[PDB]
Amino acid sequence: AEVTQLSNGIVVATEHNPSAHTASVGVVFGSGAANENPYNNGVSNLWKNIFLSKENSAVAAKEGLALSSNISRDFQSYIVSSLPGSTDKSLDFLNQSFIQQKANLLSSSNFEATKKSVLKQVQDFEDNDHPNRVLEHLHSTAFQNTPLSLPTRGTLESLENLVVADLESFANNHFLNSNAVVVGTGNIKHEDLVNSIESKNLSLQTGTKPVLKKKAAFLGSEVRLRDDTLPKAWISLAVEGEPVNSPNYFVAKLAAQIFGSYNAFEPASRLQGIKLLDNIQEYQLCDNFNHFSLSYKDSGLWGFSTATRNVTMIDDLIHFTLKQWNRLTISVTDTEVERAKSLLKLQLGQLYESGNPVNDANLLGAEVLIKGSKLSLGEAFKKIDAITVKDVKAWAGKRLWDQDIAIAGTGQIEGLLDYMRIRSDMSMMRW
């Protein structure tokens, strides 16, 4: 009823949900793509896929279990889902995969087949997923030569050069008890899980701490992947944002909610209380846009992504959007701040109070790894309601006004002006 957190060597964290009809048990490691290098980039993604390999999944399915794995920038997860009663069967599989097995999943035929699978996977993403590919390039240029610049799926070049040894090296260096948290969500009790874990013994690399490196840094820059054969222009643009556990974490998320998301083809989306919408609908400057406040351990990105077929008016799209951002520093109104509060609460509620145990597992593990605990919506909502117009203006004057930007784009971006023209729009002339 408040999320329990116990440690006996292995940190166990659970979140009991009485309305849930299933249960998820897994392990979340405090290491992701941000802990790789340009040459082993994609190793985590390769691990995810061998864990989700047919051999491993068939074994789990026979037991009535479903496997899930997510590779993020700061973390990595491996979850098993089952009925509330088969919760102990999940632990056995989990125990087996990360303690008993090794040479079973890393066999020549399984590794090569899995490698070939992720290779075609990544190739398709880079070849067809334009909005996400652009967002990945935003991170790449914004944090270039820094941990946060590496794509989570890895790069084709490094992927084709990866061997079983690379996987093992990463596992020995990151899949450690000191860098992990065993999570339990859905319909399960803490005692049931802690005792079932405390039932077994061993340690498997005890006291071993993960590798350390240099911190993430934001660099005003841009990467342009022009492709005149594509039907649209896809653009992502952002300034240095807030890291997780930043004092302005919510103020930044609220600022992003002010401008929000938009889908020109959805009737209700066109009626939102967003001033930018009055400027962009007259000549239909875009098909959609979405503002974000991405937060990581060392840094973050605040900005937006947009897609448009109006290739001759991209300059107006960017101009109007950045002119609106200017407003956060000098003229954002009370009702805009109040509307943002309500919608932010709804966003967080939908994110944290989702009816999915695997989602809760990922969120719970990631947070307890970073701050040792998980913040409740009750506390989050209180912080949000305390945000004032002066807080937004103070934050904007620091993060937005006359600040460097990172830009990424693909498709028909001839109309996207030079860096300086876009950068100049981060402020307004004053007397």
Partner 1 sequence: PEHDERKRLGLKTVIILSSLYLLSIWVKKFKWAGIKTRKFVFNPPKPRK
Ligand X SMILES: CCCCCCCCCCCO[C@@H]1O[C@H](CO)[C@@H](O[C@H]2O[C@H](CO)[C@@H](O)[C@H](O)[C@H]2O)[C@H](O)[C@H]1O
Instruction: Tell me if 347 contacts ligand X by CB under 6 A.
Output: no
Least distance CB 229 / partner 1 (angstroms): 6
Smaller CB separation from partner 1, 138 or 197? 138
Pairing mode, strands 76-82 and 221-226: unpaired
Binding partner at 430 among partner 1, ligand X, none, C-beta below 5 to 8 Å by kind: ligand X
CA distance 221 to 376: 37
Per-residue binder mask for ligand X (CB under 6 A), 354-393, x = binder: ----------------------------------------
- Binding map of partner 1 across residues 5-24, x = CB under 8 A, - = no contact: --------------------
Count of residues near partner 1 by CB under 8 A: 4
Please say which residue, 374 or 399, places its beta carbon nearer to ligand X: 399
- Classified as helix, coil or strand, 387 is coil
User: Does 430 contact ligand X by CB under 6 A?
Assistant: yes
Among 302-310, 320-328, 395-403, 413-421, the segment contacting partner 1 (CB under 8 A): 413-421
**Cα–Cα distance measured from residue 431 to residue 429, given in angstroms and rounded to the nearest whole number:** 7
**Judged by CB under 8 A, which stretch of 107-115, 365-373, 375-383, 418-426 contacts partner 1?**
418-426
Tokens representing 192 are 């049931």
Residues of span 388-427 touching ligand X by CB under 6 A: 402, 427
The minimum distance between CB 250 and partner 1, in angstroms, equals 34
419 touching partner 1, by CB under 8 A: yes
Beta strand segments in 72-179, E: 76-82
The strands making up 288-295's β-sheet, listed across from edge to edge, are 221-226, 406-411, 233-240, 300-308, 288-295, 261-263
Q: List the interface residues with partner 1, window 210-229 (CB under 8 A).
A: 229
**Are 28 and 77 within 8 A, CB to CB?**
yes
Instruction: Report, in Å, the least distance between residue 420 CB and partner 1.
Output: 6
User: Cα-atom radius of gyration of the chain, to the nearest Å?
Assistant: 23
Are residues 259 and 340 in contact, defined by beta-carbon separation less than 8 angstroms? Answer: no
Minimum separation from the CB atom of position 41 to partner 1 (A): 18
Binding partner of 429, given partner 1, ligand X, none, CB within 5-8 angstroms per partner class: ligand X
Binding segment (CB under 8 A) for partner 1, from list 57-65, 98-106, 232-240, 416-424: 416-424
Contacts of 75 (CB under 8 A, 6+ apart): 28, 29, 30, 31, 32, 362, 365, 366, 369
How large is the angle between the packed helices 314-330 and 249-259, nearest 10 degrees? 130
Q: For residues 43 and 411, give the distance between their C-alpha atoms in angstroms, rounded to a whole number.
A: 29
Query: CA of 269: how far to CAs of 209, 293, 310, 331, in Å?
Result: 48, 20, 19, 24
Task: For residue 418, state whether it binds partner 1 (rule: CB under 8 A).
Answer: yes
What is the per-residue DSSP string for 351-417?
A: HHS-S-HHHHHHHHHHHHHHHSS---HHHHHHHHHH--HHHHHHHHHHHTTT---EEEEEES-TTS-
Cα pseudo-dihedral 371, 32, 250, 407, rounded to 10: 150
Which tokens hold the place of 134? Answer: 């652009």
Q: How many residues does the chain have?
A: 431
Determine contact, residues 155/41, Cβ cutoff 8 Å.
Answer: yes
Q: Which of 334, 420, 429, 430 binds partner 1 (CB under 8 A)?
A: 420
SS3 (DSSP) at 6: strand
> Between residues 272 and 403, which has the closer beta carbon with respect to ligand X?
403
In the complex, the smallest distance separating the C-beta of residue 305 from ligand X, rounded to whole angstroms, is 24
Q: Does 334 bind partner 1 (CB under 8 A)?
A: no
The verdict on 268 binding partner 1 (CB under 8 A) reads: no
**Of 109 and 229, which CB lies nearer to partner 1 in the complex structure?**
229
Stretch binding partner 1 (CB under 8 A), from 103-111, 145-153, 159-167, 417-425: 417-425
Q: How far is the CB of 417 from partner 1 (least distance, A)?
A: 12
Query: By the criterion CB under 6 A, which residues form the site for ligand X?
Result: 402, 427, 429-430
Query: By the criterion CB under 8 A, which residues form the site for partner 1?
Result: 229, 418-420
